[PDB]
């Protein structure tokens, strides 16, 4: 572990070189513990009060959980107001 | 096939094509083998054309029986690959099992098109939009049958096309197999274009023929649905359970 | 037909003057789910139709779109399964293929007069060769070929107009524009819109064929000082003009920021007078029988963009003797006093 | 001994097929049923990986062979390499967190979570199969379900992107089928499909180059290679966050892993001909996909091109005929799996909160959503190849495999390293442009009346759970190298002689 | 967001690259960026345990038992090492925990944010899937507005 | 041999006429591809010392369920030592050449024994071989220094 190395320019070096490794089993065990932590969180925080996707902000307007609900909504509500406008013109504005 | 009633469209399309494939094996391999070079080219041309234009027409068709006819043209174009290969370098077993799957996965599609037309009335394709909400089972059956016809996952028509292209590659028909695969993708497009409609729905993209579907005002649980679910099963599992069908189709070596 | 597309273009004005055509379509056949594939600034006008369904945004006069967008809209028009198209994009080949790629039974379109329509007849059911290549320069009608084809005599009468330009406002736009002019110094009954201001903006709803359509402010200051105030509310196309208008006509004058033509029509319906220059405000005033005067740069453009001035009996049309929109600013005041009260 | 990999692969489908009708018409029941199934499957995967997988032996473990179709010699070959177990655990982790992120979906959530489990089975089937035609089956089995959870969930022009993706991927899977047909039929006497029996064949160069073309056109779209990469910016950029975090997380890695299985150790003498050009392609790919990303106003297409850029290092490590190069390729597969997954997750949640897409709009939202801001910043740093994150050690070990390459010479190594490391100047540009456009600033119209909701505990756990392996692999890379490196030698032993 | 009317198009597409922030001319330093806010005196107590447990209680759907097992799960796996080395017992217990949690997450409350977007019309409290097994209410057709007020 | 990217076999580095090999084959701890930098005779003489010091300070790494990393570090640093001894022998003074190559042979036979003990997950034999290979590592370290 201890080695003295001579160098012309500056000084001597007292290298130590603790060659180690986590080991094959401990690596498997940290994979195990992190997957178990992922299980615990996936269940618990999945059972947490998700404050955004519960209120009338998301779930109110549309809120299906898609990414086209905004665009299909603002493409439908024009159609709904146009249909209500035709219904209003059906009964003399 | 647009004018004729849907059930006999199914019967005559599938039955005439399987009988004419029996003849197109019989009157070509037995009496016309001496000129089998020239003959092959003819069928090859037709096969390539029947693989392309059919699967290239039904993309831009608004009807349903009509684009089913063109998809059937494409499927028979795949069948001519197994017609071209002889009995030795990949036999007629691929053609046989593909006609089996073609029956099983086209009569199911025609059964779903029949039930959509005995409950809605029409056969235009834009009326299919919204079937997933009214009828999840019929929509699932038609989607599974069309996916068998296109053949993305391990269904009947996928593995049938796989056997055909296997025999074609092994015999050395590269321009048949490559074009057939191109047009298989080209058919996957319009099959999913159908599956777009009977999975989507927006309360106005549906029609007033889909809005009033009325499954329950019916005689009973019909025997139409019995053959429909039989065809769905026979388009799903025989892709998986294919080894018995290959083994019972390989012992037809006496066609000469 | 059952579903009908529309690939129109031009902006605010040209999308507005297509409402007679869409009402004609819905009068010809009982039930038509109409769709519009127009440019931005054109979809907004389609709040005021009560006869349309989707009104997507395409800008068909791009000529060089993103192939992603091009193929997306091609497949969209395919998957909506139309039976008629009725472009009035004014292009032949290239665009004729864009209408043909849509599974449409009756492809209808306009056509360049030049050689650019080399093969449009191979894909279209109707030709509709046009004039001036700048169809809005043709004037208010702009669609007489499209109209005199739509509902031709086959069984019954055409009835190509239905009391032309019945625009219609919703209650939400009415409420928000009411809050807008009440935040201004105006009352719902006694106020007058303007909608002519020198700007550099596409929200003034001018045209594609008129360049000297928007009048200056110092000349507008002289116009509005010549008239006693019936509280003229100013309709700017952009906020940068507000601090300009207050610098010209005075801080006391009330300005209302309207860029949406639906909000503009909601302003018109509550207004009791219109002093518009050649914008969409004139036609929105002729809609709902509101009294306009309608300044113009020439009697030719005035007759072209207002041919039916003798039918509403309130829109006393005004023009300029010479060009360049240098009008009298004297007699316009006189018949403004006549018609507004 | 025991059918392990089979009950890994079939279990998501065989447990989602229990949702035939299941009359529970809220998203709660099927959401929890399927996250429970995904956790169970992940735990089965780990118990196969921990107590029944020797990490030193660079051979097939948990092998399993049946007979499906005798005519093709088509078996149910299953097997785990050193270069495939990491992708399998990544599939488990990322798809599990994807169905966690899909908790708020309620449109047709039964069908959504079933198709998620179908992808969950198909991806592990593609990674665990040692049969060529089965690799094709599980390649095309993750084609329809992704289409159905891409066209009906997420994205404005979702239909265009979905049909583009499905037809592009099918038009490349046919090239894959040409390849497996070529190898199986024209491979040798006694035609077979088992890759374990197949990796020690002759394959003369005039035929090996043909197979390599037939497989490279297949894997050039899944790991996007810049002639054939246009499906991604439409597909990812117009998909939901839960689907997109496995479209980039694990679906992009097949094709990179495939270039290791059926190209690197099945066609080695042809890869020695083609890798010199794949190197130039990857070096141009990094710069191209890092220069297109500032070109994108969109937020999500920026990250799609970011994935096209970070796949360039995997292309380079694969085309680097070295142990460091390929180990860096596998490590970058896993690292960018985590990174792109969490980045697409955060971009989707940012779109859900803000409801703006383009970076011209969407100015300063850091005070509105600070948790999203910090997680996006940390994961942009991980995308940046920043030390302390796995991206650095990946995008450095690939460099080290270049500079220690025996194939290439210094006249080429200099140019390659130069064009590679311009990538890490251009990557700061687009990533921190995204950050300063979408988070740094103040919008006077957004003062208090909006008051958007911050990252809830679920989304925070998503981002943190994908972060901790990135940090753990940046501080100790042998969580990923040690499971592959031995196998990598079993690759390179086929190359040096 | 909602945008019942069509929004106004911005005539100034500020730029492809530069952010959408206000300029330094109009930036009130200190108050906006928080560089001179936070005058201590308006702050509150709750030193690190009266605000952690407050935050845990702020976001939680865990009852007495589900939740107690959640608190004791990760300590059980953490003591799966450094106290013993059971092996497969850990994974069998973790699967048991997941399955019993999912069975528990078939909650008696149904919390209407779980349901489809089309359900949000009004009066949805009268809808009670919470108690009514085999609901039998054909409202999920989503093609016509039925009156479910009975 | 087209300048950039020599193609085909990807050759190994050669063995220049030395008896440093095993005579029942070449050698078994040889890593196939490693970039041994052609520094120079003083640089090789010092890098032998450094790699031998590494293999010497690999004492902590050895233990139960860790022999794979032992084998990997062994074959790596022994491949470095192999090519460095090859360049040192090939550039020796022809009077210290024979003792140095006999030293390398009796060192590499022990590295082979150590790799055979560690690849087979034999811990006790690994350590019992590590004893005399540590003697040899200190021997080469005090030779090069």
From Swiss-Prot, chain C:
One cellular-component annotation, GO: chloroplast
Compartments (UniProt record): Plastid, Chloroplast thylakoid membrane
Membrane-spanning ranges: none
Reported consequences of knocking out the gene: Malfunction of the NDH complex.
Membrane topology of the entry: Peripheral membrane protein
Keywords, sorted A to Z: Chloroplast, Membrane, Plastid, Thylakoid, Transit peptide, Transport
GO biological process: photosynthetic electron transport in photosystem I
Role according to the record: NDH shuttles electrons from NAD(P)H:plastoquinone, via FMN and iron-sulfur (Fe-S) centers, to quinones in the photosynthetic chain and possibly in a chloroplast respiratory chain. The immediate electron acceptor for the enzyme in this species is believed to be plastoquinone. Couples the redox reaction to proton translocation, and thus conserves the redox energy in a proton gradient.
Assembly and interaction partners: Part of the chloroplast NDH complex, composed of a mixture of chloroplast and nucleus encoded subunits. Component of the NDH subcomplex B, at least composed of PnsB1, PnsB2, PnsB3, PnsB4 and PnsB5.
Protein name: Photosynthetic NDH subunit of subcomplex B 1, chloroplastic
The encoding gene: PNSB1
Range covered out of full length: 115 to 455 of 461
Swiss-Prot record, chain E:
Species this chain originates from: Arabidopsis thaliana (Mouse-ear cress)
Topology with respect to the bilayer: Multi-pass membrane protein
Species classification: Eukaryota, Viridiplantae, Streptophyta, Embryophyta, Tracheophyta
Residues of the full protein shown: 51 to 200 of 212
GO cellular component: chloroplast; chloroplast membrane; chloroplast thylakoid membrane; plastid
Example GO BP: response to oxidative stress
Protein name stated in the entry: Photosynthetic NDH subunit of subcomplex B 5, chloroplastic
Function text: NDH shuttles electrons from NAD(P)H:plastoquinone, via FMN and iron-sulfur (Fe-S) centers, to quinones in the photosynthetic chain and possibly in a chloroplast respiratory chain. The immediate electron acceptor for the enzyme in this species is believed to be plastoquinone. Couples the redox reaction to proton translocation, and thus conserves the redox energy in a proton gradient.
Subunit and interaction comment: Part of the chloroplast NDH complex, composed of a mixture of chloroplast and nucleus encoded subunits. Component of the NDH subcomplex B, at least composed of PnsB1, PnsB2, PnsB3, PnsB4 and PnsB5.
Compartments where found: Plastid, Chloroplast membrane
Gene: PNSB5
Taxonomic superkingdom: Eukaryota
Main location: plastid
Residues spanning the membrane: 65-85, 86-106
Keywords, in A-Z order: Chloroplast, Membrane, Plastid, Transit peptide, Transmembrane, Transmembrane helix, Transport
Curated annotation (Swiss-Prot), chain F:
Keyword annotations from UniProtKB, A to Z: Chloroplast, Membrane, Plastid, Thylakoid, Transit peptide, Transport
Role played: NDH shuttles electrons from NAD(P)H:plastoquinone, via FMN and iron-sulfur (Fe-S) centers, to quinones in the photosynthetic chain and possibly in a chloroplast respiratory chain. The immediate electron acceptor for the enzyme in this species is believed to be plastoquinone. Couples the redox reaction to proton translocation, and thus conserves the redox energy in a proton gradient. Required for both formation and activity of the chloroplast NAD(P)H dehydrogenase (NDH) complex.
Protein name, per record: Photosynthetic NDH subunit of lumenal location 3, chloroplastic
Gene Ontology CC: one annotated term: extrinsic component of membrane
Organism: Arabidopsis thaliana (Mouse-ear cress)
Protein family (similarity comment): Belongs to the PsbQ family.
Membrane-topology annotation of the record: Peripheral membrane protein
GO molecular function: calcium ion binding; electron transporter, transferring electrons within the cyclic electron transport pathway of photosynthesis activity
GO terms of biological process kind: photosynthesis, light reaction; photosynthetic electron transport chain
Protein's cellular compartments: Plastid, Chloroplast thylakoid membrane
Quaternary assembly: Part of the chloroplast NDH complex, composed of a mixture of chloroplast and nucleus encoded subunits. Component of the NDH lumenal subcomplex, at least composed of PnsL1, PnsL2, PnsL3, PnsL4 and PnsL5.
Disruption phenotype: Impaired chloroplastic NAD(P)H dehydrogenase (NDH) activity leading to the loss of post-illumination increases in Chl fluorescence, probably due to a reduced stability of the NDH complex.
């Amino acid at each position: 572990a201890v080695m003295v190395q001579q160098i012309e320019g500056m000084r001597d070096i007292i290298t130590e070189k603790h060659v180690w490794h986590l080991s094959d089993k401990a690596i498997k065990n940290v994979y195990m513990f992190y997957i178990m932590f992922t299980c615990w969180g996936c269940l618990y925080f999945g059972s947490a009060k998700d404050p955004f996707y519960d209120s009338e902000e998301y779930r109110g307007d549309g809120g299906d959980g898609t990414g086209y609900w905004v665009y299909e909504t603002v493409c439908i509500s024009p159609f709904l107001i146009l249909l209500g406008k035709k219904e209003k013109n059906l009964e003399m504005h | 096939y647009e004018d004729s009633p849907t059930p006999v469209v199914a019967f005559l399309s599938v039955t005439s094509k399987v009988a004419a494939s029996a003849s197109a094996t019989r009157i070509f391999d037995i009496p016309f083998y001496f000129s089998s070079n020239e003959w092959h080219l003819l069928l090859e041309i037709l096969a390539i054309l029947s693989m392309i234009f059919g699967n290239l027409i039904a993309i831009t068709q608004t009807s349903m029986k009509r684009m089913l006819a063109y998809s059937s043209i494409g499927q028979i174009g795949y069948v001519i690959i197994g017609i071209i290969v002889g009995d030795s370098n990949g036999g007629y077993a691929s053609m046989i099992t593909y006609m089996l799957f073609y029956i099983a996965m086209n009569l199911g599609t025609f059964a779903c098109i029949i039930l959509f037309g005995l409950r809605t009335g029409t056969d235009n394709i834009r009326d299919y939009a919204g079937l997933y909400t009214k009828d999840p089972f019929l929509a699932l059956s038609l989607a599974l049958c069309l996916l068998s016809l296109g053949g993305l996952p391990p269904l009947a028509g996928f593995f049938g096309k796989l056997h055909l292209f296997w025999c074609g590659w092994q015999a050395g028909l590269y321009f048949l197999v490559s074009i057939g695969l191109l047009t298989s993708v080209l058919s996957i497009y319009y099959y999913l274009k159908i599956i777009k409609l009977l999975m989507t729905g927006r309360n106005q993209e549906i029609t007033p023929h889909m809005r009033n579907y009325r499954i329950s005002p019916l005689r009973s649980n019909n025997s139409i649905e019995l053959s429909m679910i039989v065809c769905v099963i026979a388009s799903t599992i025989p892709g998986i359970s294919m080894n018995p069908i290959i083994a019972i189709a390989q012992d037809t070596l006496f066609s000469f | 037909v059952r579903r009908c597309c529309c690939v129109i273009s031009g902006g605010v004005y040209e999308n507005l003057l297509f409402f007679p055509t869409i009402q004609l379509i819905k009068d010809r056949y009982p039930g038509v789910q109409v769709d519009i594939l127009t440019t931005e600034r054109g979809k907004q006008t389609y709040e005021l139709n009560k006869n349309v369904r989707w009104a997507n945004v395409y800008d068909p006069d791009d000529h060089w779109p993103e192939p992603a967008e091009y193929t997306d809209m091609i497949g969209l028009l395919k998957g909506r399964y139309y039976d008629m198209v009725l472009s009035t994009k004014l292009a032949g080949l290239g665009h004729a293929a864009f209408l043909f790629m849509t599974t449409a039974r009756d492809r209808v379109s306009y056509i360049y007069p030049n050689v650019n329509s080399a093969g449009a007849g191979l894909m279209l059911s109707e030709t509709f060769t046009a004039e001036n290549t700048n169809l809005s320069e043709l004037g208010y009608s702009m669609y007489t070929q499209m109209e005199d084809w739509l509902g031709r005599p086959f069984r019954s009468v055409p009835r190509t107009p239905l009391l032309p330009l019945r625009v219609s406002i919703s209650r939400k736009v009415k409420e928000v524009v009411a809050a807008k002019y009440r935040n201004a110094g105006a009352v719902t009954g006694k106020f007058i819109v303007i909608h002519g201001i020198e700007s550099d903006s596409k929200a003034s709803m001018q045209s594609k064929g008129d360049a000297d359509s928007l009048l200056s402010l110092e000349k507008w200051a002289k116009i509005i000082k010549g008239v006693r105030g019936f509280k003229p509310v100013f309709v700017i196309p952009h906020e940068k003009e507000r601090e300009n208008v207050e610098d010209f006509v005075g801080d006391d004058t009330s300005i209302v920021f309207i860029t949406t033509p639906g909000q503009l029509a909601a302003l018109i319906n509550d207004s009791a007078g219109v002093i518009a220059t050649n914008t969409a405000a004139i036609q929105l005033a002729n809609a709902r029988d509101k009294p306009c005067i309608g300044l113009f740069s020439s009697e030719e453009k005035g007759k072209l963009f207002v041919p039916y001035a003798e039918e509403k009996s309130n829109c006393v049309i005004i023009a300029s003797k010479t060009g360049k929109l240098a009008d009298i600013d004297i007699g316009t005041v006189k018949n403004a006093m006549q018609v507004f009260e | 001994d025991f059918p392990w990999l089979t009950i890994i692969v079939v279990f998501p489908i065989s447990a989602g097929s229990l949702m035939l009708f299941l009359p529970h018409r809220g998203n709660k029941v099927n959401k929890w049923y399927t996250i429970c199934i995904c956790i169970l499957e992940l735990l089965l995967t780990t118990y196969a990986f921990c107590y029944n997988f020797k990490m030193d032996d660079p051979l097939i473990q948990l092998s399993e062979d049946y007979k499906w179709i005798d005519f093709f010699d088509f078996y149910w070959r299953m097997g785990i390499d050193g270069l495939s177990i990491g992708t399998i655990l990544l599939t488990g982790f990322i798809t599990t967190l994807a169905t966690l992120a899909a908790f708020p979906v309620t449109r047709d959530s039964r069908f959504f979570h079933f198709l998620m489990l179908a992808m969950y089975s198909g991806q592990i089937g593609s990674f665990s199969s040692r049969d060529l035609l089965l690799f094709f089956i599980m390649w095309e089995l993750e084609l329809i379900p992704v289409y159905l959870l891409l066209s009906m969930w997420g994205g404005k022009k979702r239909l265009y992107s979905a049909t583009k993706f499905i037809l592009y991927t099918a038009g490349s899977s046919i090239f894959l089928l040409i390849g497996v047909l070529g190898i199986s039929l024209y491979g040798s006497n006694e035609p077979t499909l088992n890759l374990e029996l197949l990796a020690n064949k002759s394959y003369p160069v005039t035929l090996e180059i043909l197979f390599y073309i037939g497989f490279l056109i297949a894997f050039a779209v899944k790991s996007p290679i810049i002639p054939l990469h246009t499906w991604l910016p439409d597909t990812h950029g117009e998909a939901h966050y839960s689907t997109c975090m496995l479209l980039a997380g694990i679906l992009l890695k097949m094709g990179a892993y495939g270039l290791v299985r059926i190209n690197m150790e099945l066609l080695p003498h042809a890869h020695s001909m083609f890798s010199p050009w794949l190197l130039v392609v990857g070096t141009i790919q990094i710069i191209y996909a890092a220069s297109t990303s500032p070109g994108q106003r969109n937020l999500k297409k920026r990250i799609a091109y970011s994935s096209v850029s970070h796949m360039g290092f995997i292309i380079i490590g694969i085309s680097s005929i070295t142990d460091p190069g390929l180990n860096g390729a596998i490590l970058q597969i896993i690292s960018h799996g985590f990174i792109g997954a969490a980045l697409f997750f955060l971009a989707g949640t940012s779109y859900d909160r803000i409801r703006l897409v383009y970076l011209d709009e969407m100015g300063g939202m850091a005070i509105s959503i600070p948790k999203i801001f910090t997680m996006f910043t940390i994961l942009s740093m991980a995308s940046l190849a920043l030390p302390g994150m796995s991206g650095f050690i990946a995008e450095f070990i690939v460099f080290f495999g270049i500079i220690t390459s025996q194939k290439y010479f210094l006249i080429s190594k200099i140019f390659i390293i130069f064009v590679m490391a311009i990538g890490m100047i251009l990557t700061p540009i687009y990533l921190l442009s995204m950050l300063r456009q979408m988070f740094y600033g103040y919008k006077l119209i957004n003062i208090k009346n909006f008051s958007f909701f911050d990252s809830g505990p679920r989304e925070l756990f998503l981002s943190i759970s994908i972060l901790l392996p990135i940090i753990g692999i940046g501080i100790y890379p042998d969580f990923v190298l040690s499971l592959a490196s031995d196998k990598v030698e079993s690759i390179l032993s086929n190359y040096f002689y | 967001g909602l945008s019942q009317i069509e929004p106004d198009i911005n005539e100034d597409p500020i730029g492809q690259f530069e952010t959408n922030s206000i300029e330094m001319e109009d930036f009130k330093y200190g108050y906006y960026d928080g560089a001179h806010t936070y005058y201590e005196g308006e702050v509150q107590k709750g030193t690190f345990w009266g605000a952690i447990a407050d935050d845990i209680a702020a976001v939680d759907q865990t009852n007495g038992f589900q939740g107690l097992i959640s608190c004791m799960f990760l300590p059980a796996i953490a003591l799966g090492m450094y106290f013993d080395a059971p092996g497969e017992y850990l994974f069998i217990g973790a699967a048991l925990f997941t399955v019993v949690f999912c069975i528990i997450e078939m909650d008696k409350p149904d919390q209407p944010h779980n349901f489809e977007p089309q359900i949000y019309k009004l009066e949805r409290g009268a809808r009670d899937k919470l108690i009514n097994d085999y609901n039998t209410m054909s409202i999920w057709d989503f093609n016509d507005k039925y009156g479910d007020v009975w | 041999d087209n300048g950039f990217w020599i193609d085909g076999p990807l050759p190994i580095p050669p063995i220049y006429n030395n008896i440093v090999n095993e005579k029942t084959g070449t050698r078994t701890f040889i890593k196939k591809g490693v970039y041994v930098a052609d520094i120079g005779t003083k640089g090789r003489m010092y890098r032998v010392k450094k790699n031998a010091f590494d293999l010497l300070a690999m004492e902590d790494l050895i233990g139960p369920d860790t022999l794979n990393y032992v084998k990997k570090y062994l074959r790596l640093k022994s491949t470095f030592l192999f090519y460095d001894f090859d360049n040192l022998i090939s550039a020796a003074a022809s009077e210290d050449k024979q003792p140095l190559t006999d030293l390398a042979n009796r060192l590499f036979d022990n590295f082979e024994k150590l790799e055979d003990a560690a690849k087979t997950k034999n811990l006790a034999e690994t350590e019992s071989c590590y004893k005399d290979t540590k003697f040899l590592l200190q021997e080469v370290m005090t030779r090069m220094a």
